């Protein structure tokens, strides 16, 4: 399919949207309604992650989360602003948004000419520290600088399940926005924090992965060009 969403633990579910160059986000079925991590890549996509929403829950969705600045995790937020969902952010992920979404935009579009050119959405509702949702059951916290300068950890304590967005994930990647030598000092600065963790899901490539896909990327990024 374009798009799946699957059961991992419990209310929480992980998205697979193949649409473009595959990114993975998460849905937490709660019991006043549904927040969703990572808006997906356009309104087009959110869309259709509602469609497949409404095949499990009648309940609203409350807000989403936009992770980073990036495309790929606030491309949605228009549709998610046009059915009454709050998009939630760091203040750092939306001042940044505001002015490097043009920027992000066209270069998205460098490598995928068939992606849209989006007007600016951004966040409504925005956190100057670390943030709970869902009756402190989705845990956002920043960690430093990594992938983007912004990036943030979404935790889910009673499935141990971690998501880092587009920190997290098995193959390198080309590393444009990057912090290469700062981006093992925050993963290590996340594995000091000792959370427990059985899945922790990537936001590119395959998802599903245990705790040892932060030693594998850590890895990979310590070997890098200007690491
Ligand atoms: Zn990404």
Redesign the pocket.
């Known amino acids: 399919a374009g798009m799946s969403l699957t059961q991992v633990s419990g209310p929480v579910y992980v998205v697979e949207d193949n649409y473009y160059?595959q990114?993975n986000s998460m849905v937490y079925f709660g019991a006043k309604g549904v927040t969703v991590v990572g808006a997906t890549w356009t309104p087009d996509t959110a869309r259709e992650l509602h469609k497949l929403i409404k095949r499990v829950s009648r309940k609203p969705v409350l807000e989403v989360i936009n992770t980073?600045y990036?495309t790929?995790?606030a491309g949605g937020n228009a549709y998610w602003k046009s059915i009454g969902a709050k998009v939630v952010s760091t203040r750092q992920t939306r001042d940044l948004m505001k002015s490097d979404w043009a920027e992000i935009v066209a270069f998205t579009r460098k490598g995928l000419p068939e992606y849209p050119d989006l007007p600016l959405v951004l966040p409504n509702v925005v956190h100057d520290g670390d943030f709970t949702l869902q009756e402190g059951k989705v845990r956002a916290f920043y960690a430093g600088p990594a992938?983007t300068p912004d990036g943030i950890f979404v935790y889910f304590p009673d499935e141990q399940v971690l998501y880092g967005?587009?920190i997290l994930?098995e193959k390198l990647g080309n590393l444009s926005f990057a912090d290469v030598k700062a981006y093992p000092q925050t993963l290590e600065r996340l594995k000091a924090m000792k959370l427990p963790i059985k899945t922790v899901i990537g936001?590119?490539d395959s998802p599903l992965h245990g705790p040892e896909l932060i030693d594998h990327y850590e890895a990979l990024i310590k070997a890098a060009p200007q690491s």
Do not use: A, I, L, S
């Open positions: 160059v990114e980073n990036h790929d995790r992938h967005g587009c994930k936001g590119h």
